[PDB]
Chains A and B, each alone.
Chain A
């Protein structure tokens, strides 16, 4: 409703770096809000794509940003009559970024790993890895829970059980208020998908450079499965947290699985022990139901509600014809211990191939009416196909069925405007929560400031 579309701010990064693939706000020890941006195709030392991270200070005129430096050198350790290897080439550092406290967590989902023992090997596979940083202090740490030293032969003898070689840890990420990092690994357990959690404080204290394989005893990974419904489901394509069990001492996890049950798609709510409390099945096959998940209380009853995006949903139209436009599902949490029923609201896109629902960002309370609001991206929507971000306002009955404001893309075609969103933070300190929108196709980020309501 009250996002300023006239006077935007623009940050930018190197060409072909996909600057803006992922972003998030970041407050320092003194509360100064900045913007962390991930550029997963930034050039490294060998003039090769490795990714990179930038920490943009707040400036109404935007501009260039300084780099948040991480080690980009490949590592090798000969230990235990074995040889450990890390390959950061095309790792995609910055394909996801998230902030918690004064710490930044940037991840390289496609960092490769291999172990050599004589003529055998573990296979060169993308286990993924995340890089943690405390900018003010300069502290650094890593976290790669899917690295292993098991040889290829062993996996064959065991029928490829608990195979964490293709995890891609960091594909998605989130951190609880308590400080528990939770990584999505949609390739873990032979493309079933796993989760991996660990306290940030324990990641830092248990990490040392050059070890490559170290233990984080406080960590906790999810479990393999024999059920074909989970085969090739990419469990962990998207991840979020919230409260869905009444008990406040516990934190519940939300996991997206856009290809669960033969490309039907599903989202599952779990406890911190990965025990499923509920499951939300897709409505249409290959709609990628679960591509994005958002958690926010939209009706102001204090109970977190759930939002799921199916960007490839094909709406039914006249003459028995389907039209890929996308869709978003709203699930309002019921009072006390009860199951999330059918969706309370169905928001469907309009632009063909627009991919409505590819991203869903909680905005907080934008118009300051008491109800929290959201933004839904259609990175290829709008009459031009350049992109669009639609704002939907909260009400006692859930969400408004029509958007209050539509942000058209200020970038050229193919910018993927809206592929990454983030809101519910007041960066200019005007008392209103603002919205940052990424456009990796144009290597830029657009900041929309919220202003007092005109009406």
Chain B
């Protein structure tokens, strides 16, 4: 996912 990360930067979400």
Contact = CB atoms under 8 A, between A and B. Distances in A.
Contacts of B1: 159-160, 190
Contacts of B2: 160, 190
A123 to B, nearest CB: 12
Contacts of A160: 1-2
B3 to A, nearest CB: 11
Contacts of A159: 1
Contacts of A190: 1-2
5 contacts: A159-B1, A160-B1, A160-B2, A190-B1, A190-B2
A232 to B, nearest CB: 10
A190 B1 CA distance: 8
A160 B2 CA distance: 9
Interface string A127-171: 000000000000000000000000000000001100000000000
Interface residues of A, number: 3
Interface of A: 159-160, 190
Nearest to A163: B2
Nearest to B1: A160
A259 to B, nearest CB: 15
A408 B2 CA distance: 43
Nearest to A231: B1
A190 B3 CA distance: 11
Nearest to A190: B2
State the 4 A-B residue pairs at the shortest beta-carbon distance, nearest first. Answer: A160-B1, A190-B2, A160-B2, A159-B1
A188 to B, nearest CB: 14
A443 to B, nearest CB: 36
A12 B1 CA distance: 44
B1 to A, nearest CB: 6
A159 B2 CA distance: 11
Nearest to A159: B1
Nearest to A191: B2
A190 B2 CA distance: 8
A223 B2 CA distance: 19
A3 to B, nearest CB: 47
A160 B1 CA distance: 7
A187 to B, nearest CB: 12
B2 to A, nearest CB: 7
A151 to B, nearest CB: 18
A39 B1 CA distance: 35
Nearest to A232: B2
A154 to B, nearest CB: 16
A224 B3 CA distance: 19
B4 to A, nearest CB: 10
